[PDB]
Ligand binder design. Structure first.
Ligand SMILES: [Ca+2]
Length: 434
């Protein structure tokens, strides 16, 4: 209850500790020096080895010259402390074999620079929760979260991968590879991807736990304007897929809820698939199995799962290991209202209050149909979406400074107004978004 990572944390990573018991680290520069990272920069902060909450007394775009690989856990990245808001560009932040990490109110937008990379990834970790973040403009995949234990991605925008870009192997507009050992993916908007929205990992890619623990819950997400495929994969992995919203856009070719790949080591009750709303297909909506495809063999094509196939479970599945911290599942109607009308998704606060940047705002408005989409809606470059990087950054620079004379990461003016509590960094950070 008070062990929760934060007030509305849910799903299998909801009890992640992050850096709640650590030092405060203030990032006060947008610079990056991969060779000698200076104190006060993101690279230096994330490479520290002690428990830490990283806060931001700076706003705008951090142009990474190289990836940051995060190996040391007990980390909270409190992106909502930034006066106007932080975007990480140029190279990915890659979490690798780490424990207890909370990441909130952060933007990861690779852009078209020198790497054919993801915007962000988390791998081989455990006790991870990512909340209210925005991911976009990748060359490899936008956001990849696989082979982690006790993981939650919630209330995030994963959108607008770069399709025909600079990847060696050709066009490559992919949402991400999602999987884990009890991993929740809930209340997310996944929009404008040629494919992999997400690609469910299954037991693949050198897992550090055995395949009978590969277990994913995917619920209350909105997938919009996928391309040739949407959700697919999950070889020999189980999953619940409940009360998601599927809304074809002008690029969408596959009309399905999932493309289940060949899974010889599971013969019954591999997935539970129910309550999903397919915009513009009343038959899939009324009976979800009409949108479920299965691959008979390693090289078989997509065909409709046969209707009495027991691969599909009658009841919601549960992981076989430990606490079933499954997320609360709401109706598809409430989900649409919350993410698209209330816009309670993505990096939607800074230290000065609510704020959804123009890129995220456009994406949600296009989902809703209140703003038009040019063509298929699958971009090849962020420069179709922004005039220039310098121009995209300006919007984050026009918010009032957060005065922090004593350098404790607490807004001096909030300290003056909360005397009995003025040194409580947790209570200050909660105040920002509550
Ligand atoms: Ca202060």
């Amino acid at each position: 209850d008070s062990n929760l990572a934060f007030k509305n944390a849910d799903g299998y990573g909801k009890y992640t500790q992050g850096g709640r018991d650590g030092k405060i680290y203030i990032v006060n520069s947008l610079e990056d020096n991969p060779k000698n990272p200076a104190k006060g920069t993101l690279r230096h902060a994330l490479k520290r080895k002690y428990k830490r909450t990283v806060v931001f007394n700076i706003s705008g775009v951090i142009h990474l010259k190289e990836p940051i690989i995060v190996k040391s856990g007990f980390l909270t990245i409190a992106g909502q402390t930034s006066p106007g808001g932080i975007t990480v560009a140029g190279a990915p932040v890659q979490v690798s074999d780490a424990d207890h990490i909370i990441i909130r109110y952060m933007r990861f937008r690779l852009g078209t620079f020198k790497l054919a990379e993801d915007s962000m990834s988390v791998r081989n970790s455990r006790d991870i929760i990512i909340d209210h973040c925005s991911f976009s403009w990748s060359v490899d995949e936008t956001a990849s979260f696989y082979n982690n234990q006790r993981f939650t991605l919630q209330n995030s925008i994963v959108a607008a991968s770069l399709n025909h870009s600079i990847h060696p192997k050709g066009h490559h507009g992919y949402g991400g590879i999602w999987g884990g050992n009890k991993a929740s993916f809930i209340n997310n908007v996944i929009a404008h991807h040629n494919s992999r929205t997400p690609r469910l990992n299954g037991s693949r890619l050198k897992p550090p736990y055995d395949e009978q623990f590969e277990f994913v819950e995917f619920s209350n997400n909105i997938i919009f304007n996928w391309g040739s495929n949407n959700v697919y994969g999950s070889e020999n992995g189980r999953f619940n897929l409940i009360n998601n919203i599927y809304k074809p856009g002008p690029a969408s070719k596959a009309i399905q809820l999932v493309d289940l790949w060949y899974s010889p080591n599971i013969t019954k009750s591999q997935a539970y698939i129910s309550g999903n709303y397919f915009v513009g297909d009343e038959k899939i909506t009324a009976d979800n199995r009409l949108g479920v495809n299965y691959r008979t063999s390693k090289d078989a094509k997509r065909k409709n799962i046969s209707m009495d196939d027991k691969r599909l479970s009658r009841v919601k599945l549960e992981p076989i290991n430990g606490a079933v911290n499954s997320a609360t599942i709401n109706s598809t109607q409430k989900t649409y209202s919350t993410l698209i009308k209330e816009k309670n998704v993505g990096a939607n606060f800074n230290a000065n209050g609510m704020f959804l940047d123009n890129i995220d705002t456009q994406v949600l408005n296009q989902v809703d149909g209140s703003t038009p989409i040019n063509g298929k809606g699958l971009i090849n470059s962020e420069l179709e979406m922004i005039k220039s990087w310098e121009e995209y950054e300006r919007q984050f620079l026009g918010f009032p400074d957060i005065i922090d004379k004593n350098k404790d990461g607490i807004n001096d003016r909030w300290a003056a107004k909360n005397p009995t509590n003025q040194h409580n960094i947790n209570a200050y950070i909660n105040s920002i978004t509550e």
